[PDB]
Structure formats: structure tokens, C-alpha cells
Amino acid sequence: SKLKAPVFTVRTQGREYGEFVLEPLERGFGVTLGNPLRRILLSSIPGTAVTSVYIEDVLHEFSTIPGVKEDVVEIILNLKELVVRFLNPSLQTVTLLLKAEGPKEVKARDFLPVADVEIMNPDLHIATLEEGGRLNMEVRVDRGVGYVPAEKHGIKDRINAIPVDAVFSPVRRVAFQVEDTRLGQRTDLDKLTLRIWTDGSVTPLEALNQAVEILREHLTYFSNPQ
Amino acid sequence: SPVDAATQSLLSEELEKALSKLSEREAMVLKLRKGLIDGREHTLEEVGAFFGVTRERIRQIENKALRKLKYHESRTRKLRDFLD
Amino acid sequence: MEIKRFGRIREVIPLPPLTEIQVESYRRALQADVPPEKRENVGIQAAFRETFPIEEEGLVLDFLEYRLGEPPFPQDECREKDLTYQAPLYARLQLIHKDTGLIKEDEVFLGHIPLMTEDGSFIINGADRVIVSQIHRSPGVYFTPDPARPGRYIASIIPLPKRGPWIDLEVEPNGVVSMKVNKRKFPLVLLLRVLGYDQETLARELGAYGELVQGLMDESVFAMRPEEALIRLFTLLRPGDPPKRDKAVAYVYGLIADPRRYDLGEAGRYKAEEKLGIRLSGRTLARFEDGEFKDEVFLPTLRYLFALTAGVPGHEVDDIDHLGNRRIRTVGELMTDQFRVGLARLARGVRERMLMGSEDSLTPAKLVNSRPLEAAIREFFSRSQLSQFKDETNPLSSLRHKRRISALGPGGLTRERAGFDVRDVHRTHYGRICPVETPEGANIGLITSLAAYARVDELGFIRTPYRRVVGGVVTDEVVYMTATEEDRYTIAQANTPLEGNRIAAERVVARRKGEPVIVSPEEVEFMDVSPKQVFSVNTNLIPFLEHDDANRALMGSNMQTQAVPLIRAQAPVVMTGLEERVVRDSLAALYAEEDGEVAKVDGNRIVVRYEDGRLVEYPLRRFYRSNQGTALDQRPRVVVGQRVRKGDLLADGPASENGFLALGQNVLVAIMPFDGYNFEDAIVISEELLKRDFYTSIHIERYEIEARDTKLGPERITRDIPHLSEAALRDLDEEGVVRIGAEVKPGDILVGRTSFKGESEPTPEERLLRSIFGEKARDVKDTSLRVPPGEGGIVVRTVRLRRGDPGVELKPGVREVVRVYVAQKRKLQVGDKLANRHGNKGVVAKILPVEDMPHLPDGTPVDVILNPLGVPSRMNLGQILETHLGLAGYFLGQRYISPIFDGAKEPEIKELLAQAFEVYFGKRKGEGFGVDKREVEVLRRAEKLGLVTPGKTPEEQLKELFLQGKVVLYDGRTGEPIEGPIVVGQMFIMKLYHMVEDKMHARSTGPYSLITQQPLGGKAQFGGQRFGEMEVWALEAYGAAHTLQEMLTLKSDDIEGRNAAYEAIIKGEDVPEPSVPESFRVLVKELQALALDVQTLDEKDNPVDIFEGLASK
Amino acid sequence: AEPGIDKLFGMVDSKYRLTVVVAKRAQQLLRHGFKNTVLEPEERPKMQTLEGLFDDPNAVTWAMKELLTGRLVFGENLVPEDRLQKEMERLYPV
Amino acid sequence: RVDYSGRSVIVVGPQLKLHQCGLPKRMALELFKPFLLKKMEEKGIAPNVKAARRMLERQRDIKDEVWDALEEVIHGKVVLLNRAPTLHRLGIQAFQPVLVEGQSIQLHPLVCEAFNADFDGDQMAVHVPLSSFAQAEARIQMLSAHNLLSPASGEPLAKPSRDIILGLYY
Amino acid sequence: SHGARKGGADTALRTADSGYLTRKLVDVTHEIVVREADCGTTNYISVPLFQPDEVTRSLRLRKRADIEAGLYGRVLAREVEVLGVRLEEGRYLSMDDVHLLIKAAEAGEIQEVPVRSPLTCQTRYGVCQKCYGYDLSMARPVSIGEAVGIVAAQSIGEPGTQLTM
Amino acid sequence: GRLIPAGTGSDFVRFTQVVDQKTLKAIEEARKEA
Amino acid sequence: YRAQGVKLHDKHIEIVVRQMMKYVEVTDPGDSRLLEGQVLEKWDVEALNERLIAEGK
DNA sequence: CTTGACAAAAGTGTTAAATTGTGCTATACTGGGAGCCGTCACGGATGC
DNA sequence: GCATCCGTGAGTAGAGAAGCACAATTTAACACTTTTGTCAAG
């Protein structure tokens, strides 16, 4: 009377969005599977983020730089959009140096290349410099999971360095849907659709595989009593 | 009822196809004998006057037509459900 | 499980017998047990003494005494054989020869009197029936002001209903007082001349009221003698009729003076004396003695009318809706009234047989034909509006039905004549008629309920009890007193603080003629017995009634009547204290008659050894089908050898738990929206309710079939049904009836019956088809009884009644009748209606598995999820307080009695919640568990909503939420807590008789009407849905012309169209163009029957035949 | 909502003309067994059935999608009724 | 009174689309019986329409393949839902029926205001438009998703209410 | 309890009176259908943007919902020039047009709006498309063939029971 | 039981014909070739 | 309807009011076969008047 | 194919009982019976 | 002009007590050939 094994179908477009359908499932197992994966996807997938920024002649985050349209906050907001992928597993922290002179539209590609460091979005806009404006940055990129506010980590490399909220999670959004499906005379079956948005550093398929593996590993912890 | 009226029409169309497998005079004998044309059973003498034959002549063609329809029904099974 | 009782008001007297309005009135009418010589002149005894002696004149038929015999059959046998539970009636009559001087005495059999059962109902033709009490205007003399003429008043004299004409006395604008009788207006001066009044007498009695007596002065009628005025009056009343003196005197005697034709009634006579300050000798407007008419009431009526018009002190108008002016006709009076009508018809037939002659050998048996009396009695108990099919869904349902008061019925009001005045809650309804229990809709205010402590007196007026207060101290003396007597006293409220028996509050809330006043204790003369006397039984079963809006309390009281008995029925956690009395007074449960020991306990019967030593065996009603189909069974509640005291419960009846009324279940309720499944009163339940068989009810359906004599041959009930296989006949026994214990589904045969086919030649297509298969057509056809669609269950009983059986009175031509009972165990499903006692009702829209339901931190899932949006607009806060008290009792393992208006209050509920928290949370501490991370998050939000005090420990904040009835609740789907604390508690919810199983219906094609050829109506007839004018309007507004035309023609009454539509669809073809409806053809023919030439014409005005040439000669 | 219902309403002056066109086209499709359709094979409406993907049996669904393509001509007094029925049988004997 | 009509208690269909209603299978089998008999004959369920009707007469003789054939019948088709009293034309609306287990009709929450319908025991009548005109009229003119504004005032009549407002407000 | 019973009795009698009124409205307007695009009439009504007020004895701007109930979806009978915007003759008034008219009324540039109405329609056995205006359910001009008479009767009769009576 | 003169039953839309271009052109050529 | 917050377009009422003003009463028959005080539809009398004007009656 | 032959099956002409229709009872009898009015406003006529 | 009686109308579903004589007409039980229906002959 046990249900047949479900079929895992994938609908992945590009490298930043994908839909994954598992059907048919026993009654209630769409919720049983969807929620744990969503919690892991939004908090546990390893990733990289900007955790500290140093800008010359800048004292606090709520100031501005003469010679650029964007104030410190807007550039910090643009830096939180930066997606970077480490090509070395042993690599833990890098610093990216940016020296640009106006009149220039500073992009993510203007960052100095670092060995085994890949900028996934080199077209990301950073700042717009007018003539005579000098922009010197040293941004610190760490490795982590989930979302860490700047105050809860407070990472500063040098004096006057501004901690920035670290969006470590490569997954940008998870939405799972459970629909009623049938197989013959059984009508309480579940159809689970998992939709994952990712920044592109990892595939939504890879994020799902990592989330499943994390949940599998935690299930092995219910062994060796006491 | 609409159901009763419909099954009457379905029975007529199935019988008309079953009688098509018969001959020309042979099918018309059953139609005239059972009253499928006028609505009344025509006696053998009345049927015999129409085709210019004796009474016992119809009984030969009428019964032989009956036997062949039984054979067709056993092979096609298209009239059994119309009697229950 | 302990029961904690709230309340401060001590009830000096208990509730009266809740069925005494039925039981006592019928006992008084029958007087079966009192010996004949001591029978009082009431009831049917009064009916005999009024119609007899039947003096034709000279033969006189006198009545000596009557007696009622034992019923021929027991109550259970009457139900099985469709018999009336009745007692034979014998009257000892004597025939007196005035000339010869010889008396012939014999006992004549007058028929059968239906008998009331112990619980207060009747078995009429095997069906349980309740005679609903009727309210109407009391007879007497009334003085209402003229709305057309300010300052003018009209005097109304009302006799008993259908016992005389209404009399109106009015001072006309010209001055003369006018008497209106039988729609004829004539001057009242003429009548007083007939009744022997002189000009000097009228001036002496009524000359002291202005010049109004001058209008009562016509010199023409004072000149004529009373005998001449009597003929003069007869001409006005009956113009054209020859005015002979003997004919004239008989008409006036029969109009105002004949006791057998005019009856003011005991209540009417008493009201007349009280209002007019006189003493009536009888119950007629006048008395005929010494060959002349003597006045009895017209002079006091006119004297009061002039005094009221003159504005003298002590004279007032009469409120006709005042409950002292409205009386109740109970079952005894209603039956007696119809008994008198039948006896009058019997007396008339006695006179004509006396006119026939043959007096040499005339006996009272020969003169008396009892059939007119039996027919009138049979008509009352069968076809009267007040005689109603007994509502016995649950024992409370039958109790309410027997206490119903109806303003409708014969001699009653109609909804057209029912204005706001009759339907409003008059101030005198207080303590007598419940201001809440009423049917919402067109019958609002027209059908009411007797108040819990109220009782109907001999005159028919409802009296309510009050405690006598003297010297500011409240005594135990209880006075039952009418509305008119109540208006004379200052009556304090039952909640007035008492120090012992003395009123302690300096300011006392009281009523004076229904108005709320603040008085000193020394001004208080009476006190209310209890808050319960204001309301009826159903309303008194609603806890925290004071916190519910009246409109929603109406719904709660009404829906308790609709609750179905449950196999695991539970008494509510929060009760009002009347649950025991309802079960006890319904006679549905079984109690020990006196002290004794139980000898035998079985599911069928209980045997108790009483102290005196006699063995009493009580058969138990088991799986009995009520009028509504709910299973009524009694389950024993004692063991062998158990000692029982007098009145101890022996067996619970339907919807009862240990003697307490159990109309539903006690379930864990979370008050919160849930994913739209709570939308607009919809209810979410857990699957755990189904697992433990809560809200599971047993329902029994009865199926009947008759084998008849037919001209072509008798129908045979047999197992040999032609053209049916062994699978269809598998469950039938050798007699053709389905075996007991078989499961039957829609389309299954309950009993096989063959009927001889009508002689008709077959269609030629069938003739050829039968000839091919070599099968000779049989002489009988399938007419067996089958399970209707959507029904079925388990066969539990087959009743077979045959012609010639003792007591079985089959109709002629019926050889036998077979009845099959099918029982189904119904679990709660989507579409079933649930309700609580506070008017919150809804259908189950979603059944969730246990892991999906919200659950407590200890893992306990809730049972029911209710939408909080149903509370604020309905303003029924009693359910919230019930939920809070239920939450405390759930963890303290105890139940509560909180009487209405005197019971559990918020401070005392919260201190119960404080103790319930110590087992709710203190048990967690002992188990080695602190505060959940999820609880900490909810507490953090809770202080942002102002629900908990900032700075306290999580335990203290959780206790603060608990004292508000709220807990931290976890979502079973996610495990995350609900962001705000949720009110969770235990509430009593009922499963109502409206079930989607009995209401779902569909039809493609089916039976059609005879004349209109349109589909029949009703699920029982497999009918189609009614597409009325408003639905036609909707399609017209949509422009859906073709959709409208199909419903008008193709799907209702286009005979050619509907046949062609069905044939086209089953061939995969589209339905053809519709044609003229057959109802229009009926309309045209019916218009021709009215000699109207209705013709359908074309563009060129030429006639168009819509009858296909079938009606053209 | 029906797919392209806004576009369907925009192609007719009266919303009830659209219903007449759709219904008349549907019966044309039913009369000729959908052999007179203007839809390309990849444009045919489909039914998901346990035995596989099949053509949609509802001609009203077919008619609405045909009108969205623009290959249908509707109007009053376009062709005689008798000539329309006869000619369409010649092209699609069915 | 009309043929091809039914009636049942209504419950909320929160998961339904605006153009959808939950129709019980047992109701739909009776409502669409003449269409189902033709569909059963096209498949191998029954040899002819008359034997197909005999199959549906007895509940215990109904095979599971009949329910599969019923789905193909109702594809693209709509039914009419009506709750008395029909005060205005939105008292009748067209919905594509979704076959549901149970005996209750599932009604969309957003059409309840137009019907003046709640879920405390209201019942609704179901009607089946038969021909192509009738189906086209219901699908185009009477569909619930095509009637969103009040004909009386022009304001949105199928609009958020009750829990929908409360959740969005919160 | 007196008021609760009184309100329930009022509701019971109001449903019958409301249902009777709707049936009378249906039977007097059932023949009114949009039968043509334009009847060709030049007659119209002027919807007032102001109403007299007795407490001040002056003209006060009417409520916005009241102006919308008389102007929304109505065809302009004459050209209107308000706030530099030319509202041409024959223009169907959208909700934005109504609000523009209210804004112009508050500026003192207009007091009344000439609109085509069923009252001045010359169509026999019904109304024309221009005199009726918009199909409210569709926020667009009414389609020829709609039984606006039935719609009007239902529109008036449907809230009949919601009246306090 | 007639088609009401409103909506789809109104004379303004009831007589509308629907035809495909293939059938329309076939009718066009038939007139020209005759 | 304003007092109860019910929003109803004026044109629905105007359709009914149009039907309430559909009939007229003849005050002077003129050169027609009508009777003074006869009640008839306004559309008929105007159409009848146009025929009379077309003939000079 | 006819042509006899049969035993029904059906039609048909009597005759009987069963059913149905009609007339007739001679003291004198000579104008009925049941109702019996708690709603409201609305036309529309019909006369003071 | 006005007062009065009459006639009209007042929500939708569903779910539920004569008897007898005799004649006159009809029914039904018979018989009868009459006509099929048929099963053997060539």
C-alpha cells in the first residue's frame, strides 16, 4: 500500500532561478519536506559576502565623498549586491582594492584581480565619479552562511573601517508550494514545487543539493545514544 | 421519459443495421411480419399477397432470417443489452 | 472530575415540572381518575353537562356520567402498527319519556379519546405528536381608545373563540351609543329596551356622566314594549326574515343569552367582574328567565364606557397585548373545545332521530351516533395546525416543543394580521415568556416559549413566582401571580445583595409596572426568585448569557434543539445547573423508583430489587428511530449488586452523560484564522475527532412498501425478480426481504416485489428483438424497493405487517406492508454544521491531520479552529468566557456550573487560570525543561502589543498571557510559533441535525409533473431545482439568452426538446433548437376554457398552430 | 479568467457579438470534427489524460483560441447561410 | 423547475481559483450523466449507452475508470452556481468545476459577498448549460473572473474581505 | 430585548417589502434594452456639482461619491473646457474625468455638467449606447443588447433590505 | 420560451456569421469562376 | 441610499423614472380620433402629432 | 418451392347470470344554517 | 369635495343517512366455425 517513489523534475533557467517539482508525495509530506529545506536554504548554504569596507577620507557611514553622486550608504548598499566566488577551498578571506579617478562610472570589474577570486557580477555599478574625484577602497570579503548584521560581527581591519551587513547566503529567496494531486483512487497526495532564487554564485540546483545534504547529515546525528 | 424515448431510437437504429446484413426481400419480410413498417403484424396470407407467395413460403424466409440474426448477434453482441 | 459551582443567589423553590403545561391540563380535562360523582364542571365533563340534556320536546336524553376504559393497545404496539394510543369513552345516558314517565338507562360507546403519554405527547396513527399551546386575546370586556376620534373610547365584549359574536359599544359622533353585532351597527338604546330598561332607570344609573346619557334617549323605543323592541331589533339584525315573535326571541336568546351558543368563559367571566366591579351569575351577556330578557353585563359595560369617557378617576384603557389580557389555551382546553364541537354535532343528530319517531322502542344507543364526535376529535389530533409532528432530535428538543406557545392556529392570528404589536416583547413577558427563544424569520414573535419558572393557571393566565418582602427582609413565601396582579407591587431584582435574609443595599433596583426604578429596601414588596425565571429552558442552558447579544443568544437556544445525540456525548465543561433537570423531566433517562439493589444489568433491561422486595424490570429503549431519524437508545449506568437510592440514575437516555444533558462534545478550541478555511463562519477540525469517534451519531431511516391487490393480479413480495442476477439478489432472504445485518448501498434492493404488467402490445422493435433472442415476455415486472441515491447503511430491523394481523388496520386492497430500518453510523465530515450555545455556528470546511493542527508546547494539538472575526460583530462574548473557563478546567481536570447572571466572573476565572498555569507550566519545570526559544520570541512580540509587562521573567510573562486565556501556540506545518499568543481553551460544541449527507442532491432527468410536464421538486422525489423569476432575471441581466431559453424549454417542459436533447447528448451531438414550452400550451388551453380566443400570429398576422394540427377539427 | 478575454472583448463592438461568434464557430468545429480548424497542429488545445496528451474536446475552448489568432472572419451578411453550409461541407466532407 | 440541476451545502474553497468551484463527484456524475454515458461508450467502460446507464444505477458497480471519464467530460465546461435569494445577477455565476471528494460544494471566498453567502449552512443550486451557446454565454458573460465590478455602482465587488484584509493589514 | 425583537420583526417585514418592490421595478423596466448606438437626440440633463444648504443659505459642493454616482461613465452632451483640458462632446467620463470635474468645481470654473441620460434618450423600447454610457461592471461603454432595465431593477432592489426602513 | 431580445438574443448581434479565410475565399472564387 | 452608505448610480433610478413618465394625458384632441382625458404613451402621441403636422391637421 | 395435413389461436353467435337503471311506496308533516372579524395602504369607483 | 365599502397586493429557496320490485343493459360463460401457425410431404 506504500506509495510509489516520486519523480523529481527540474525547470532551471539561467544560473539564478529554478523550479523543482516532486510528485506524487504522501499526504502532508510536501510541507514536511518544503519547510526544512527552505530554512536550510536561507541560513546554511555556504557563501561569501562583504563584511567590512574602508574608504579614504571617510570617518562614518552616514557621510558623503566630495566627487561622487553616491554617498557612503549607497555605495555600501551597492557593495552588498556584490557576488564573488572563491576558486580555492582553503581560501577564507580576501581584500579587494579599488583605486579609480573621476570622471568615471566605477563598476565591479574595476576591482583589482586577485588569485582564485572571481567576481560573478562584473557589471554591478559601484559609484559615479565626477572629474577631480578620487576613490580609494579596501573591501574585506569573508566566508560564511546566512545573514549577519554589521553590529553583530563588527569586523574592522583598520581604523575608520565601516562594518557592513554580510549577505553570506547565496540564496536570495525560497518559495515552496504544496498542491493536491491524485494517483488513481488516492486523492490526498501532495505535489511539492520548490522555487529557489540565487545570486548566481551557486546554481539553484546546487543550493538544493547542498540543503538536502545538510539535512541528511543532521539525520545521522540521531545515532550513538548517550 | 427522455431515457425511454432515447433507448427506443437506439434500438431502432441497431435493428435497422442488423436487418441490413439480411437480403432485400428477406429483411422486408421481417419488417412486414413484425410491423416495423406499418405498426401492425401482417399475417402470412397478407404478407404472401404482397410478394405473391403462399403462407408457408413466408414462414421459411421469416424463420431463416431469424436464425441468421441470431448468428450475427452472437458474433457482434449488439442487441443483448436492449432487452434487459 | 470535580464540579465547581459558582453563584450567590439561593433559589428558595426548584423549577416546576417542565411538562406540567401539557400533563396537568390534559389530566384536568379528562378527569379519568376522579370518581364521577366528584368530577368538577370542567373539561369534557363540562362538555357533557352543556350539550345535555338533549330535550327535543316529549323525549329527553340526559347525561349521568362518563368513564374512560383502558387503552386497547400499549404505546409501543401503537407505534409499530400505526395505531392511535387512545382510551375508549363510554357515557351512561338515560332516555326520559316526559309523558309516560319511564326512564331507560344504558352505557353507550362514544368512541376513543387519545391518551397523553407520561412525557406529555400523543401517539396519533403511530406517530408522536405534541399539541402546542395557543396564546390569544382573553375573553372579557375591554376599553380601547378610538384612533380616529381623539378622546373617544370603544367598549369591546369578547367571548371564547367561536363561542359568540364580538360586541362593540361606541358613542357615535351624533351622540347615540351604537352596538355593532355581526358587522351590523344598530343603536344600543333598542337593546336595553329588550332587556327591560326604563328611561328613568338609565338616567339614574348613568345620568351622572356629563350629557352622554342624552345620547341614550330615544323616545320612540321607550314608548314601545320590550316585546315590540325585540321584534324591532330582530328586523335590524335579520332584515327580510319574517319577524314572528317565537322566531325573534330565539335569535336574540341565541345571540347573547344561550349558554350552549354564547360562552364568555371562566377567564372571560372573571375578567368581566374584575374590570366592571360586578358579579356574573353565568357566562352569558344576558339571562332569559320568566319569559323575558334580564341584563347581566351591558349596563356595567356602558357605565364604565361613559365613566372612562367622562375622565372620572379609577377608569383606564386596556392594553390588549398586556399578558394579563392574553391567556393560554393548553392541550386540555383545545381538545375539550373540539370535543364540545363534536358533541354538539352528535346532539344535533340525536334530535333528528328523535324527530323521526319510533319512540316505542327507542334506546339511547339507537339515538346516539358517535361518529360526529369521533371525527371532530380525530380531525383535531391529525389536521390541526396546533397538532404538530413531535420534534425529538434530542430529549431537549421534545421538552422545548411541549413548552412552545403559538399565536397562530385555528382561532388564532395569521402573519398578515400579525403586526409589530403582537410580535414585540411586551413588558409583562418578564418571567412568563422568554424574551429570547423565538424563530427568526417570518414567525418571529409569533411562536414563543414558556419561561422556566412560569406556569399557566386554571384561567389560562401565565403566573410567575416572586418572593414576599416585608420590613426590608426577604421571606421564603413564594407567590405565583399574574401580570395584572404584578403591576400593583414594587418588585426587586434577584441580584439585590442580601445579608442573611435582609436586604443589605440601601439602593435597590426594582420594577414598577415593568419600569426600572431605584427604591429603598422598605419600599420593596416582592423579590424575583432567580434570574432563571426570565428565560426559557433552552436559554437557561447558555452559560455566560449576560455576555451575549440577544440576537445571537436566540440562535444558541434554538440550535440546542437541533443537536443530534452522539455515541460519546459529553456534558459541557461549563454548565448553568439545569442539565440534570432537563434529562430528569424529559423522561428519556431511567431512575430508581425507591431505594434498592440492582439485580440484573443488560443492554436490553435492568432489574432492581427494591427494599419492599418486589422485582421491577425496566426494558431499555435500544436503537429506536425518532421522528427525525436520530437513534434513541438507553445505555445502563449501573452494575449488578449496586445499591441505588431513590431517584438515582439507572440508565442514560439519548444525549445524556451520567444524568447530565450531553448535546455535544468538549473539544480543545484555538481562536485564530487558519489559511482561509475559517472564512465566513467556516470551521476547521482535526482528524483526531474522527479517530476517537467524537461527533459520531447513529441515524436510522425507515423504508416502506406495500403489496397491493390489482385488477390484473396482486403484487407479490418475493425473491424471484425477473431479469436480475444473483448479485442483485444476494442479500435477499427466501421471502424477498433484505437480511438483517446486510450493508445496503444506493441501488441495492431492500425488498423484492413483482407487479403484473398492464396489458399493452409491445412496440414492433421490441417484438423483433424478443423474437431474435427466443425469450417469451413474462407477466410481471420489477417494482422492488431500492435504496435511494446518497443513502444506505446497515439493515437492523424488518417489520412485516400482514392483513388479518391483530391490530393491523391495513387499507383495503393492501395484502401486506414491509418496513425496513437502515442504520448508518455518521462521522463528522466536510459540510456538517457545528454550533456552540452562544450562536456561533458553521459548517466543517476542512479536516486536518493531527500533525497539521496548531499544538501546545507540550505537544497537545487543538481540536477545532474558530475564526476570531465571528465574535466582534455578533457581540457574543460568552463563548470567549466559556473558552477561558474551559482552559482552566482542562488543566485542573474539573467542570463548572456558572448560573446565568449569577456565576463565574472574570476575577474568579483568572484565579482558576492561575492554578491551571501551575500544572500547565510547573509540570514542565519538574520534567527538566525551561522556556522555549520559540516562546521567548512570542513573549518579545507580546510586550510590543502591550500584552505582558516588560522586565518580568519569561515564566511570569507566560503566566500573564495564561491569565488572559492565551498561550504560545506552535504551527504544526512549520514548527514555528504563531507570532501572537492565541486564545486556547475547551469549549462545548454541538453537531446539528443539518447534515450535507441528507442535503446533497442532483438530477439529470427524472419524474415530471402531470399537467405542466415540468420536473418535480424535492430530493425525495428526485426533483429538479427551482429556477424562479429572480433567477430568470439574473440570466436576462447577463444577456444569456440561450442559457435562459434552455432552462425554459429544453430542461423543463419542452417534451420534444428534452427528449431530443438527451438523445443528442448520448450520441455526442449538440442539442437541437428548442421549441414551445408545454406550459404555454397549457396556458393557451386554460385561457380558451375562460372563453378567451388566444392565437399566436406570424409576421403577416396569419394564425400559427403551436399544437401541430392535433387540436384543429 | 478565459485566456485572452481582454483581447476577445476588444475585437467586437458588443460583448454579446463575441459570444455569438464563439458559439457559432464551436458548432462549426463540432459539425466537421475539428477538421475545419484554423489552428496549427502545435496550436491545438490539449487535454492531459491518463492515457496521454490528447486534443481538447471542448469546441468553445477551440473557438476562443481560434479567434485570438485572427484567422477567423466574423460579421453580418458576409456570405449566404445556405452557400456557407454547402461550401464548408465540400472542403471538409467529414 | 429544471433538469440537469443539483444542490448541496457550500464550504469555503480557499485554494480555488476565482473561476473555479469545488463540485462533488457524486453530484457531477448525476449532473453530467448523459455526457458521461457517451464518454463511457467511447472508451471501453461500457459497450453501449444503455449498459453504461445500468452501471451507474448501482453505486457498488461503478468502476474507477468512470471517474476518469467524468474528468474528460467536464474539461473546459462551466456550471452555474446560484444561492437564493437572487437579488442581483451575481447571485448566479459560472465556475469551472473541480471534482472533489465529499458532498459539499467548495465556493471561492472572493465571490461570497456577491452571493451574500457565508458558511453557516448556506446551500447553492448547480446548473449545467448544455449547448455551445449556453456554455459560451456562461464562460464569457457569466464567469466569476469576468464579473469583478458592481453593475450597480462600478466599484469592485469581488474584492478582499474578512481574513484577506486582516492579513494584508497586519 | 425589546429592541432586539423589534429589529428582527422589522427585518422580516422589510424583506417582503423589498422583494415586492424589486418585482414591480422589474415588470416596469424589463423591456428597456440597449437597442442602438445613438438615438441622435440633442437633449440632455445637467448634473449639479453644487447643492443649496439651508444652514448657510448658499451653494455647497456636493459629496464626491454623490458626484461620481451621477457623472461616472456618462457621455458628455456638450464640450466642457475645465482647467485647460478640453472634454469633447461624446466623451465617456472616466473616474479621472469626474475627479478633474470636481477639482474644476472647487476652482469655481464649472457648476453643472451636461451629460446624456436615459431620461432624455429618444430610443424606443429602451435606450441608446451613448445615453446609457458605461457598463459599470466593465468600466467601458455599454454594449448594445444589454438588458439595462433588469440591471437597474436589481441594482435598486438588491440593497433594499439593508435600509433601516 | 423564446429567445429574449437582449444580449446574445438581440438583433444587433444575433445574425453575426463566423467563417475562416479558407472557406471565405472558396466562396469568393466560386462566384468569380461561375 | 446615501444614508445607509449604499452607492447606486443615478442612471439606474433614471431608467425607472423614465418609465414613470412614459404616459401623457390628452388635453385637446385636435383633429385626431383621441378623447380628452385619454391616457397614452408619450412616444405614440408625438408620433401621431408628427403625422398630423405632415398633413396640416 | 406448393400441399397437404394437423392443434391450436382467434373470431363469433347464443344464452345465461350479473349488473345497472328506473319507478314507487297514501296519517300528516309546508321559509336554513353556520358564523359570529387582532393589518395595512393602495387605487377606483359610487354615490352623498 | 368627501366619506366608505370593495378589490387589490404584501421576498426567494427547500422541506415537509331506505328498501324493493321489475325492466333494461352489460358481462361472461359457452358453443361454434375461421384463421393462423406449422410440420411433415413431394
Ligand SMILES: [Mg+2]
Ligand atoms: Mg448563512
Ligand SMILES: [Zn+2]
Ligand atoms: Zn439616447
